[PDB]
Subunit: 127 residues, 4 copies
């Protein structure tokens, strides 16, 4: 099933949707990075979306400390897999994670060949 | 808890999000209509979004027959409730429901004061 | 400027884009209605987007009085003429206009088969 | 036309809009990078959006060669100057350009504090 660096009560979740087919975007590769002290993007977690277009178990709460994170979504592979030429090489979401703010982070991405929209839902409850 | 005309294995679900606060849009009124024989919008189901920004139990499968449906979202009340002047009177989603197509319908709406995006996810599994 | 029904400084303009092809949505039919005293939609103006995906000259400043307007974009025909059976019947934007004096409104829509985004840009004329 | 680094027919243009105020996003800093032979991002061009939310003259057609480019929009500064702590650090659009000959690219972004949409309009020059 879905997983990542550390499957636990998801502090970070990714949901990807397909605006052309009206369906979840399945088997889409997602790579998470953490900005290191030297400003380089340290690999953090990675995975592929499930049949429901979701990626959970990426990280556990112990290791999800405040910092700058980058979620890279391989949208090009996805569109190539459907016979459609896309515009973007990938879609990235860069944000800061702070403790004062709600605990859970859901990054949602809605995809089209020449356009993508992303939203963040920060909460306290589950999902 | 959440409900509507007939709470069952949700053939139709609504999910509303707030792009300004990064949270689900709670207590948002949603009215569903069915185009009648005389082309008027017959009231069909209605409700308010839950704490998770979702509305389920709107209809049951027996009564969700092929037809043209309209989902009206009272976005103006929502923004007025936050001290923000919105542009739209409401957001409507009009679509045809056909049996050949997947069984489940999830209408998602992402809201901002002067802009809204809506997507449909049509599937066979749950959600 | 252009009184009667022309377009003084063009108070109402529509811009449609295609998220699947990365281009303006050409020849999209647009119908505008104004809410009449009797609470019914009265035909106000109509046209089709140009090669640039824009629609100008829908109304003159003199006739564009305060009121509730509905801009209906025939998205279904557009996608069908491309061989795609889309989800929505059309896209509708309903808003109150000119309540605090005359303004210039630009309604933009970004189209995908199972999704659409709309935003409004409201300017205060200066000439 | 304008060779060197000006803008012949303006091959690269950025348009930024604000979904919370219903207006162009003025004075937004934009940085463009090109992927160098060594797989590192090299500074290619930069500027700020005008009162219309547009950024023109970033490059000339002669210097806008085939390559992978990254358009970085400083969304964080924009929202902060408005008193809002937004979710994202910035918005980045990465794409391959001019691989099948020269084209005109228009990168559009619609901004909200916890969300952004981006689309591309690619035109084939004729003059």
């Amino acid at each position: 099933g879905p997983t990542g660096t550390g499957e636990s009560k998801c502090p970070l979740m990714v949901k990807v949707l397909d605006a052309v087919r009206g369906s979840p975007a399945i088997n889409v590769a997602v790579h998470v990075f953490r900005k290191a002290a030297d400003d380089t993007w340290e690999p953090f977690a990675s995975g592929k979306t499930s049949e429901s277009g979701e990626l959970h178990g990426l990280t556990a709460e112990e290791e999800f400390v405040e910092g700058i994170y980058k979620v890279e979504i391989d949208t090009k592979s996805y569109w190539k897999a459907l016979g459609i030429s896309p515009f973007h090489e990938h879609a990235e979401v860069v944000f800061t994670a702070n403790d004062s703010g709600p605990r859970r982070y859901t990054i949602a991405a809605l995809l089209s060949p020449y356009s993508y929209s992303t939203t963040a839902v920060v909460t306290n409850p589950k999902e």
